[PDB]
Ligand binder design. Structure first.
Ligand SMILES: *[C@H]1O[C@H](CO[C@H]2O[C@@H](C)[C@@H](O)[C@@H](O)[C@@H]2O)[C@@H](O[C@@H]2O[C@H](CO)[C@@H](O[C@@H]3O[C@H](CO)[C@@H](O)[C@H](O[C@H]4O[C@H](CO)[C@@H](O)[C@H](O)[C@@H]4O)[C@@H]3O)[C@H](O)[C@H]2NC(C)=O)[C@H](O)[C@H]1NC(C)=O
Ligand SMILES: *[C@@H]1O[C@H](CO)[C@@H](O[C@@H]2O[C@H](CO)[C@@H](O[C@@H]3O[C@H](CO)[C@@H](O)[C@H](O)[C@@H]3O)[C@H](O)[C@H]2NC(C)=O)[C@H](O)[C@H]1NC(C)=O
Ligand SMILES: *[C@@H]1O[C@H](CO)[C@@H](O[C@@H]2O[C@H](CO)[C@@H](O[C@@H]3O[C@H](CO)[C@@H](O)[C@H](O)[C@@H]3O)[C@H](O)[C@H]2NC(C)=O)[C@H](O)[C@H]1NC(C)=O
Ligand SMILES: *[C@H]1O[C@H](CO[C@H]2O[C@@H](C)[C@@H](O)[C@@H](O)[C@@H]2O)[C@@H](O[C@@H]2O[C@H](CO)[C@@H](O)[C@H](O)[C@H]2NC(C)=O)[C@H](O)[C@H]1NC(C)=O
Ligand SMILES: *[C@@H]1O[C@H](CO)[C@@H](O[C@@H]2O[C@H](CO)[C@@H](O)[C@H](O)[C@H]2NC(C)=O)[C@H](O)[C@H]1NC(C)=O
Ligand SMILES: *[C@@H]1O[C@H](CO)[C@@H](O[C@@H]2O[C@H](CO)[C@@H](O)[C@H](O)[C@H]2NC(C)=O)[C@H](O)[C@H]1NC(C)=O
Ligand SMILES: *[C@@H]1O[C@H](CO)[C@@H](O)[C@H](O)[C@H]1NC(C)=O
Ligand SMILES: *[C@@H]1O[C@H](CO)[C@@H](O)[C@H](O)[C@H]1NC(C)=O
Ligand SMILES: *[C@@H]1O[C@H](CO)[C@@H](O)[C@H](O)[C@H]1NC(C)=O
Ligand SMILES: [Ca+2]
Ligand SMILES: [Ca+2]
Ligand SMILES: [Ca+2]
Ligand SMILES: [Ca+2]
Ligand SMILES: [Cl-]
Ligand SMILES: [Cl-]
Ligand SMILES: [Cl-]
Ligand SMILES: [Cl-]
Ligand SMILES: [Cu+2]
Ligand SMILES: [Cu+2]
Lengths: 708, 705
């Protein structure tokens, strides 16, 4: 037969109610953001305002009234003598009655308007400008190089970031690419890039500050056109069609025998109800910051809270290149938004077929809430590898082991060319693992000139541009309580005389232990040595008299960070650190800001500031982990970068936290002596598997929903 | 719903038969050999010369002679020695060549021979019959000892002494715990047994250590106990829970997830050869050096001639003399020899292909380890690549990652090494190893803080490092290889279009590493972010075709070079080395290193001299490991979570594009297309195609020796 909420993101209803309250208080001249002009008032985003920790915990611990459910709305105030962007807390939910400007309280004064994210409508006006007023002037050149037609629109633009060279600039370098049918346009740079100054509040005043074409600078398109017609521009002909991996994603090889499949022979061993996940071992709440991405709250292992908050905070790509676009590209992805750019998960490709798929709701650049279908997936995965194992042939014949099954929570952000995969993995040892992967397409530029310093040629006329990937996580561990310390354990060798034979030397291996007392002592720069055992500990001990701890262990090949002399470095100064442990502060909720991208020269949040002459001995601590790598593009990144070897992140592992390994108590654990029948059901639960897994896997009909 | 094959039963028998005929009548079963006997310690495959092997595989030349190497212990003579002997050809042997002098410049001294099972038996006889009864009163009081009873067991350490020629071993004493690890039950007694002499009657106890103090003899200890001076802490010999058993007190609940092949397996295993639609190779197990893979071909093209384990090292610290001087060089026992059956559904997925291993080690007749290897495909539950497009053109393109895995496990006393080789559909190869099983422990006394944590009652979990050394013979698009270092750098320059401003210009650095010394990277050094071996020829895009080495290691501080034993495993000092592959440099270690690290039989650092690595047959040597400070969570066993180290071999301008583009299992659809129609998406076709009840063979277990 067939085989058998404090931290929740705002629901459709809640988002609706906040919008309804905003469309009353803000006046009648309020424009839908999807069609808003720079000089308009519009609501850019509405999402959950995470509750204050003390009121949150008091509710969860002794059942005090929950803190008010609040939303944070980012409003673009364009229709006034001095335009600003404002942050507005609306509450309470479900029935809003107040709205409070927290801009000044948070930033010391107005959020300057040029720090606002570029709207969808703004990109549309930029395209309206480029395609209708600007490219027509180079009609001749474009006709010859680029299969251009009168109306046509066979070329497309791609933004870079940041937009200019100092605070208050809003000049973006746009590259132009063949609009490729059914596949990545990013590998088909026509060799034209345009510096667009789109700062003015009236789009009529927008200009092209500069042009770059196949290696050369021009002051305008007209000048380029006139030089082309005069005979002085030798056009390399880039083709707009072809076959293979640089043109397509469709495999020409027909499917063969089916890949292995995983299934739950007695049904799933976990539930998802709203935003909460529960298995026999793990409890937590998941969700998605619109800008800062995937997050989990209130992580309890076997009933005991380990973590207040694990959350993605920011992601960063720094480029090099032969052309202006890639030369100055520094993406601070939160400026676009990891939640906002979250995409549907393809059942059976993005996650295992039998995962539980959850929808995500949002109110971003519109006036009515929307849905991303299957934005999350939650599943148990058998690793195909033991958790623990011992086969004993010595003195006593017995085997004892357990196969490892993990519980996973995944979402994916597709920002322009690449696809970020965010995993949180829950281990039965009580370990928590965070990993991210950068797959999808690379950015490329038109190949010209001396190759070697900026990436490799990856296809016809195209250079895969060198860059680094980095991401920053907030890890607010509360190890057996709020109050934590930080320990550094490592090793050393001390030469001393062999006690029983003094004329001989031995190297005595010893453990070193240092309490890290001030924040600076727990700030570890990229490229420097970190102690082999770094852990946050409670004050209290386990049965064996050792402080109960959780170790932070890093898996990162960090790229060299942008040098400090850069005037924009402070816009993502978290990149300089592998790790930092600070006092958790209500007024330091994020290491980044949606506002940093378009003005890193005057950052809205500067992570450096968090690290000051401050004690970390007996405080509520949060660790901040940077994970990343250099990526020099190469042929086998075409058509897509693979995930193998490119998964960076960290482990959180119990270190004298328990009195013994919790998995000793696993229900799935296997043991038998050499003098009993390992083939019998009373002895080995794995022997009942032939019988107790002889059903046909229960599989839903395949459905995919989401192309906005 | 075969050049590289380990010797078979018949072949082992034939070499053994040939040896008994040719070595004369003085030959005794090694199973009961006295130190002064002649006996055969082992017989296994002699790997074939590379040139000839390639000649056969690529040019169709006659296969090289099938040969065995037999290690013989020549104890029955005025100058005792151990000899390595080449015997061939197979199937019907005809010659016996002594290669000892040839390989080592001189005879192998006898004190280098690994300790025999029989030698361990005699040591126990001495201990339990002649030695321990002298402290009978104390043992009765502390340790539930009974006259002519063996409720205690011993455990060897290594190396055995302080200088070349010694053979004195510290043995700890433990409760013989029934059905669980005896290692967590140190009784506090350790004895330094001098067993150098060829006549066991002349063996001695050089030192005693009991509950934190030294004594000259078991007799002085006993007298001092009877005299009222020795305060004996009482260690119990029974209990419940993790430090006493491995059996969960919790009943099974719902079944954990299980992987099956909807239309049967997608790879074959024939003898020692595996083949899938992407990969071809041969696997085996060296008696001493462990798991190896040979002739790895991706889609028909050889990436690697040999990838093999070479050595595993555990360096201990502690309160007691045993822990204090333990430096296990595990090849001196044998990662092959101590290979153990894999338990179906725990050690590997239930539906893996399982393979036996044959060996002739310390006996007259070959034996088998059942289910020694497992091969299987595994759905990672992760995409290999993926792109969802909402921009300009609406489409999805992706592929779930399935990998192919060869796995073996060796149990050397307390620990279980898991050796994984993973073959990815992108053309990458991954080597990982895990250390699980029991920790080694000592009786707890004095200042806790410097040698590990208390992990259970009366028990110190002793601090130690793990390391393993791998041989990686990449032949990147041919024998002649070069080594490239790529990395990144920022150069300040004025913005071309706005020279009043500065940018940080990101650039790639590139350097050719021409000499061996340039490609030797000591532990704790930074290495080039992109390090790769490359052919001389280019991919379609003008770039030298290369395979990069990416390392994942938290390596421990190596034993200080100032230690007179450090040369017995000098590979510990390196993360990575690249040398000319030479026929006289087949291993970075040796079975004889464990009992004489002071005068090593192979010294790895010797392979690194002033030689060129520019257009030669290159081999990369990779070290991986970590520091392990035991903690409560290691009880009963150390879990494998995040405790896997090793490396990736990943294509870097090797192909003209990512091979996975051509994958049979890749998926694609547009927004105008029907994502749920089967002709479009072969994944909408899986629910009904996987409506079969999976055929699970009845559970069997490999057994116990
Ligand atoms: C680990 O920590 C907890 C609490 O952690 C805080 O402890 C305090 C003392 C600070 O160090 C703070 O930074 C830590 O984070 C320990 O539990 C506390 O233990 C102290 C013992 O000193 C308790 O404080 C005492 O309370 C009594 C009354 O109950 C008072 O009479 C004492 O106050 C006198 O002494 C001070 C000296 O500066 C004078 O200023 C006063 O005027 C008084 O004369 C004294 O402060 C405290 O209440 C405990 N807190 C809790 C919540 O239990 C815990 O012992 C420790 N655990 C381990 C295993 O180390
Ligand atoms: C950024 O822009 C916002 C929106 O323009 C500014 O807040 C707005 O301030 C005005 C004047 O203080 C408020 O309008 C009304 O003014 C009259 C006339 O005195 C007063 O009697 C009314 O009660 C009312 O306050 C308006 O409510 C307020 N907008 C909201 C809803 O917050 C803001 O001051 C600017 N930021 C900074 C820091 O300058
Ligand atoms: C390590 O020990 C072995 C065994 O003692 C030594 O090898 C043996 O060396 C003797 C030479 O004294 C060989 O004897 C010769 O045997 C042939 C039989 O074909 C006989 O016709 C000769 O007259 C002579 O007696 C003996 O065969 C050989 N054993 C084998 C089978 O190798 C070896 O020399 C020692 N290692 C070193 C380097 O000292
Ligand atoms: C890459 O190398 C191969 C082999 O080149 C050999 O040439 C020697 C001078 C020396 O550097 C040695 O290390 C190296 O292995 C080149 O083919 C060789 O060179 C030419 C062919 O153009 C002929 O003399 C031989 O066919 C051949 N030699 C051997 C020994 O095979 C090849 O040209 C070169 N390719 C590139 C792109 O550099
Ligand atoms: C670029 O070309 C694509 C084709 O790849 C165009 O996509 C179609 O556009 C129409 C009108 O918007 C849709 O109704 C079709 O369903 C689209 N096809 C697909 C597969 O998405 C697109 O219009 C072009 N875009 C630009 C910016 O010119
Ligand atoms: C250690 O204790 C074990 C378990 O009690 C003993 O092993 C058993 O011995 C009997 C008789 O020799 C065998 O038939 C059984 O197969 C063994 N049991 C198991 C579970 O393997 C062993 O003899 C003791 N060893 C000593 C005395 O050192
Ligand atoms: C692109 O190339 C293919 C040939 O493979 C051709 O059939 C197709 O029509 C081309 N695309 C368009 C619409 O220009
Ligand atoms: C940190 O704090 C103390 C003041 O209590 C002071 O002595 C010291 O100057 C500070 N250290 C640093 C590094 O600034
Ligand atoms: C140890 O004690 C338990 C009860 O606590 C008992 O059931 C068990 O049989 C004992 N184990 C042995 C092998 O003595
Ligand atoms: Ca601070
Ligand atoms: Ca905390
Ligand atoms: Ca080679
Ligand atoms: Ca050399
Ligand atoms: Cl502005
Ligand atoms: Cl030493
Ligand atoms: Cl000897
Ligand atoms: Cl810069
Ligand atoms: Cu990348
Ligand atoms: Cu260990």
């Amino acid at each position: 037969p067939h085989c058998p909420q404090l931290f929740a993101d705002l629901s459709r209803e809640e988002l609706t109610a906040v919008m309804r309250f905003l469309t009353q208080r803000l006046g009648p001249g309020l424009v839908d953001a999807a069609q808003a002009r720079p000089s308009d008032n519009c609501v850019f985003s509405v999402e959950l305002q995470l509750p204050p920790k003390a009121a949150a915990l008091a509710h969860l611990d002794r059942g005090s009234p929950p803190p008010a459910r609040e939303a944070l709305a980012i409003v673009f105030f364009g229709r006034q003598p001095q335009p600003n962007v404002s942050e507005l807390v609306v509450g309470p939910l479900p029935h809003p009655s107040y709205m409070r400007d927290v801009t000044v309280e948070r930033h010391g004064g107005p959020l300057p308007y040029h720090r606002r994210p570029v709207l969808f409508q703004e990109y549309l006006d930029i395209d309206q400008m480029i395609f209708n007023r600007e490219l027509p002037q180079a009609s001749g050149l474009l006709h010859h190089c680029c299969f251009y037609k009168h109306r046509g629109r066979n070329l497309v633009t791609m933004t870079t970031a940041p937009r200019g060279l100092q605070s208050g600039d809003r000049a973006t370098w746009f590259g132009l690419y063949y609009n490729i049918s059914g596949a990545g346009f990013f590998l088909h740079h026509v060799g034209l890039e345009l510096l667009v100054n789109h700062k003015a509040l009236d789009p009529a005043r927008w200009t092209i500050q500069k042009v770059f074409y196949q290696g050369r600078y021009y002051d305008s398109l007209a000048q380029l056109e006139a030089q082309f017609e005069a005979g002085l521009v030798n056009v390399v002909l880039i083709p707009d069609n072809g076959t293979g991996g640089s043109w397509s994603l469709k495999s020409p090889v027909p499917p063969g025998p089916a890949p292995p499949l995983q299934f739950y022979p007695q049904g799933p061993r976990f539930s998802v109800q709203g935003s909460r996940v529960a298995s026999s071992l793990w409890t937590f709440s998941f969700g998605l910051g619109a800008f800062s991405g995937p997050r989990i709250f209130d992580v309890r292992f076997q009933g005991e809270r380990l973590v207040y908050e694990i959350s993605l905070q920011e992601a960063l790509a720094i480029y090099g290149g032969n052309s202006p676009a890639a030369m100055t590209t520094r993406y601070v992805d939160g400026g676009f938004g990891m939640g906002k750019y979250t995409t549907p998960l393809t059942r059976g490709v993005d996650c295992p077929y039998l995962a539980t798929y959850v929808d995500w709701h949002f109110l971003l650049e519109s006036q009515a809430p929307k849905t991303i279908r299957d934005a999350f997936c939650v599943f148990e995965q058998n690793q195909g590898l033991p958790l623990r194992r011992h086969h004993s042939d010595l003195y006593s014949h017995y085997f004892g082991g357990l196969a490892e099954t993990v519980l996973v929570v995944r979402s994916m952000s597709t920002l322009l060319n690449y696809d970020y995969v965010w995993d949180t993995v829950f281990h039965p040892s009580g370990a928590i693992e965070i990993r991210f992967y950068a797959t999808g397409y690379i950015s490329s530029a038109f190949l010209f000139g001396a190759t070697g310093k900026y990436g490799n040629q990856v296809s016809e006329h195209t250079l895969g541009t060198v860059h680094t990937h980095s991401a920053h996580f907030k890890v607010d561990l509360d190890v057996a309580g709020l109050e934590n310390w930080v320990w550094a354990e490592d090793m050393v060798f001390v030469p001393m005389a062999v006690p029983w034979s003094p004329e001989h030397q031995l190297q005595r291996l010893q453990v070193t232990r240092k309490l890290l007392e001030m924040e600076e002592q727990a700030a570890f720069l990229v490229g420097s040595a970190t102690p082999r055992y770094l852990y946050l500990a409670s004050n209290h001990s386990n049965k064996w008299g050792h402080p109960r701890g959780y170790r932070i262990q890093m898996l990162s090949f960090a790229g060299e960070p942008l040098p400090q002399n850069s005037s924009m470095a402070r816009g993502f100064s978290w990149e300089r650190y592998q790790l930092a442990v600070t006092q958790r502060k209500e007024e330091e909720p994020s290491s980044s800001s949606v506002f940093n991208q378009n003005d890193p020269w005057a950052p809205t949040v500067d992570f450096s500031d968090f690290i000051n002459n401050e004690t970390i001995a007996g405080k509520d601590l949060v660790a901040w982990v940077t994970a990343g790598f250099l990526h020099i593009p190469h042929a086998e990144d075409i058509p897509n970068t693979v995930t193998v070897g490119n998964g960076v992140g960290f482990f959180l592992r119990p270190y004298n936290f328990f009195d013994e390994d919790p998995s000793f108590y696993s229900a799935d654990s296997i043991y038998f002596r050499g003098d009993q029948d390992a083939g019998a059901c009373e002895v080995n639960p794995l022997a009942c598997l032939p019988q107790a897994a002889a059903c046909a896997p229960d599989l839903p009909a395949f459905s995919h929903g989401g192309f906005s």
